[model samples]
Target chain A: PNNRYSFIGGRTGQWQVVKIRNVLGPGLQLVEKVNILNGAVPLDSAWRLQGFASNIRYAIRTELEALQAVQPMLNRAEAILAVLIPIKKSAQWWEMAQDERRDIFERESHHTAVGLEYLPGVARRLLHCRDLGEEFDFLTWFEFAPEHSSAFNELLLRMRASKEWEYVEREVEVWLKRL
Target chain B: PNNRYSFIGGRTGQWQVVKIRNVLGPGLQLVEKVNILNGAPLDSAWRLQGFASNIRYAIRTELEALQAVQPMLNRAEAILAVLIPIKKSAQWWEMAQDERRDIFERESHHTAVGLEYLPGVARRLLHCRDLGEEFDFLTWFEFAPEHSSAFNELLLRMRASKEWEYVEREVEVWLKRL
Candidate 1:
């Protein structure tokens, strides 16, 4: 039944969904979410961006601690990366390895918005996965902190070896070469 | 007579005259608050660093905004100079004719830290003047926005402009020509 005026009822507190169809011809598809991690290009790009942000944040936080000569910075203690990675359907989880999902989620948390605000260079990309186009919800922070540069290099190499953090290795190498 | 007991004092603090004399090398030196501004080298340096930081911030902000439109990117903002034309001074306000002081302050403010951080930078120098070595006071903030190329350009330009704001313009024009 079509309500001529959903607004007339004025249940002001009620949340309503007004779906308008056929605005741009018969078929303009609106996807609820992107599910492309199964592919290489998207997955590679996503992991690269995540790793870049995470490493940068880690570096700067360490630098801050060094400058103040206070206790060192540590990643959040109790957070679980396994739970953070988003997956749409239970069937998808059944098909994939848990390790892959865990790695992605862990990288995501490290590349936060706060770090990116202080980093001097670089560009951010949207991961083609559960969170699409939403920025602040999953933003990356990175800065050039000399103190943690060596640590970043080592972790980056490790991440790359697993094929999960390859893009990160590639980009870092590119920047290094340029310098 | 020094307080014999070996204890750090209260609000007045615990410094025997002997300790003060030893550290400061005898008789105290009184300094006017305004006297700090008397020497302009430190002020000029602060201005330079501030300008460099601003240019960096501006570059990062602009680059981010630019990405929304031009993905491949086009045209970049470059920092040309960080010049502070003159060096040395006593009683800057008293010495400079009003026009000269205004120009100095205005140009410095616009070039380095923007007007926002300028006054605070100035005041900090004044606050630390009596202790000596006041020339080293300056503040800079790091930025994390994507696009460090722009920020770097600003820093590079500031470095190039050191002590030359007076002839900074000519130098820039010459560099461009060559």
Candidate 2:
């Protein structure tokens, strides 16, 4: 299958798409090639694909909590939204202790609780990009029904307002009506 | 599950989640009521159907916004773009539309401040709230590397303004077009 609209990244690459019948199916096509001297490409790239990090973990409890949170929204047919959020944590956040970070993440931010509210309605997948030399540090994917869309929006609003979000310096959200 | 962070519109209402634990297992407990205002639900599907017929209007509007800066926009010259996604509080939306406009234009001086830079600074706003996206608006801006200081000052001033009080979530992402 080919994506009707595709975003490509990198210094120099092509944007290609897969073909289905007379239309393009779900595919990742290559686009124009350009040079980015700093290795960091523009926020608006033709395609944004980066390497992934190894052994990346937010918190053992965080994953367990999230997995338990989004169990039901898995199998049913729904709208899938792919948001490519590349963020750089602020110096202040990086300076915080691990225990402190966990506390803030769990308590102040209510990261687990907030996510639980949306539960099966909004399922998410978080990917780490920083370790792989990408422009952004994380790419978060989501799936939800159109009916649950408003709830999803409210969930995001709550999370973004949390103390944890203050440390986010850069973020780009690319929304896709998954095909 | 009560949404402690719930922001309701119109009248008072309760926030609730659905329960399917026994059938689905470990899901959040369902709340009593659910309200979606008025909107259609997206059907179960693997892909988007139909073509966008009204996309041209949006393209034109974007081009006009770009033209405001393109006269001075240097392709070879390095420039930086910051995408700021901001979501306002429910209280902000509860106000009348005209009131909102007054705050954005008069109180915030969002227009006048940007006008100060003219071609040096360019901006565009995209609505994402209705699209079921995270942020209410995606505000994008572009400026030359030399004008970075001015851009920062403008951003700070805007953030500190009265209108900004309504902004609950703002994530700024900086980027350059290669």
Candidate 3:
């Protein structure tokens, strides 16, 4: 397999954190991507596409036994929404002990319980991206029928208002409907 | 038929401009997505509801598919979709077909860049700008998790190229198969 991007060269282990002193390569030009389209399409309607993909790279930290799983029925879907949430942990939250963080994530936040209630109705997938050179920490996805849209909003509100969310400094959400 | 994001008022012609002093309503927050599991069962994720047709436009382009290019998605693994909303500049629309084509392929090297990542990335494009939507285009891509870094690199290089210069409002969002 030609996995050109799989070349991993860095300090390993959970505690062995390595910082880049100087980047020799061209720095990422994170712009809106409009400077290049010379005009094959109209500006009023021109759009560009870009994505980064990666498998799970973190150790499993949660128990899946309590959760009810739902299958997405694409053929029956009258509408589908895709949401992207980017979260950043606060320094203080990281300063706490591991067990302490776990307590808030599971017990206080009721993260597991709240989600379990909407199980089979609001299906979700959690992705760990911090290990990769990505912008967000976890990519949390959710899918529910249009009728459950409001329920989805309530689920998010509850999650966001939890004690666990205090550590999340930056979180952005977007909704997409399948055409 | 309930298009949640559908709410329009007025528009200004190229030179025939119109303006409103004040307005009240909501806003939109868009971002990007990448890392995901391979194909997983999508049942409990969503329910079927009504659909509206006004928001979508299909674009048809003729091109040869390379034999080596495998399916970008699989039932067991998750798929990554990058949604970019782009608008071309008025200057680009003023150019001749030959000039536009030259910039698209020659100066921009769109086809060449795409070929370099073949068999790994699959993509489609839709036209929405003409429909008077916020975005002119919606380009969707599908690929497995392993190719994420390569996809990101391709995007960076493409954005830095001359062709991207014509784009005006490119917002990227990612979606994963639930």
Candidate 4:
């Protein structure tokens, strides 16, 4: 058996919440702090969302290799900044065939191409929550230093501008500072 | 008190349904074919009515910019039309104007999303809740052939928002000018 990670948000946690902005859909409970713990455990909090770091469902061999080559580790000494963006796509997006989704997500949006530019500067892990009845479909986290803020901002700007973002029913961004 | 609009759904009309989908609710009386016409003919099967009025929930600044950019409902090139009838739950109605506005614009980004598709998609929102109609709102949209898919995309975006969660019953009707 393997242990999976969980994101708990409440009045407690080591990571101090810098900001919480709701970009779309209904707002979540106003939690001013956060915690990341190994494995799902019963806890007293507003929410404890569970997700597993899943495989790249939309990338090809070349893209995956490119990503692996430049991808940075999560806990670098200077990587003290963290951004958590949770997204839930609409039912129509789910109904589309996997190949079709892959097309829109990559081919049309150039999601991979844009991401490859900011790699190493913004290390990311996508945690799939669809398997569970979580409020969000994907819980995505990024690690970077404060200097890499501009790269990350551009990355997000280009992403939300794409046609792929049109299907995103809900998206919220949370900025955190490590203890 | 005012007879605002009459929606006639039937087998005869100048326009054609490139496609008709029942987005939500039980759907209307199932017909093999359907169309819309200005006249509520003796040969019609259904007729819905509503009227366009001032937006009650928005601040003046929001309303002013929107009105300035929005195109008229009818245009010669804009032969396509979409009619969506929607009803909101009591919970939505119970909220104050500011609260619903928050859900409509702030939380949902409803107007912002639609603005992205304008002036390509000309739209009008008609209220029929006071008329005691089957639905509370009769929303209408018109666009050219080039913007058909864009119109559907707009529909998809709108339905996927927080504002749509308040919609309890909705039926989408598509039409084209002959």
What ranking of all candidate models by lDDT puts the best one first?
A: 4, 2, 3, 1
Report the C-alpha lDDT of model 1 over A17-91, residue by residue, as the tens digit: 122122111221222222222122222121211111111112233344443353323232221110011112233
- List model 1 lDDT by residue over B3-48, tens digit each: 0111111212111111111111122221111111112223211121
| Candidate 3 CAPRI classification by DockQ | incorrect
RMSD of each: 26.9, 25.2, 25.2, 17.9
Q: Can you give the DockQ of every candidate in the order shown?
A: 0.01, 0.01, 0.01, 0.01
Q: What RMSD value applies to candidate 1? A: 26.9
Off by over 4 Å in 1: A1-179, B1-94, B97-100, B105-127, B134-136, B145-147, B158-178
| TM accuracy, model 1 | 0.17
Model 4 residue runs over 4 Å out of place are A1-3, A42-44, B1-178
Winner by lDDT between candidate 2 and candidate 1:
2
True contacts kept of 1: 0.00
Interface RMSD of each: 27.2, 23.0, 22.9, 23.2
DockQ of 4: 0.01
- lDDT string for model 2 (A27-88, tens) is 33333332212122255455554423222223453456556655664335655433334455
- Tens digits of per-residue lDDT for model 4, B108-161: 888778788888989877766644567888888888989988887887888889
User: What is candidate 3's CA lDDT for residue B105?
Assistant: 69
For model 4, what is the error of residue A112's alpha carbon versus the real structure, in angstroms, after optimal superposition? 1.0
Each model's total of backbone clashes: 21, 21, 38, 2
**Candidate 4 residue-wise lDDT, A11-108, digit = tens:** 78878788888889976666878888866663557877777653335665567678779899889988899998999998787755544676788889
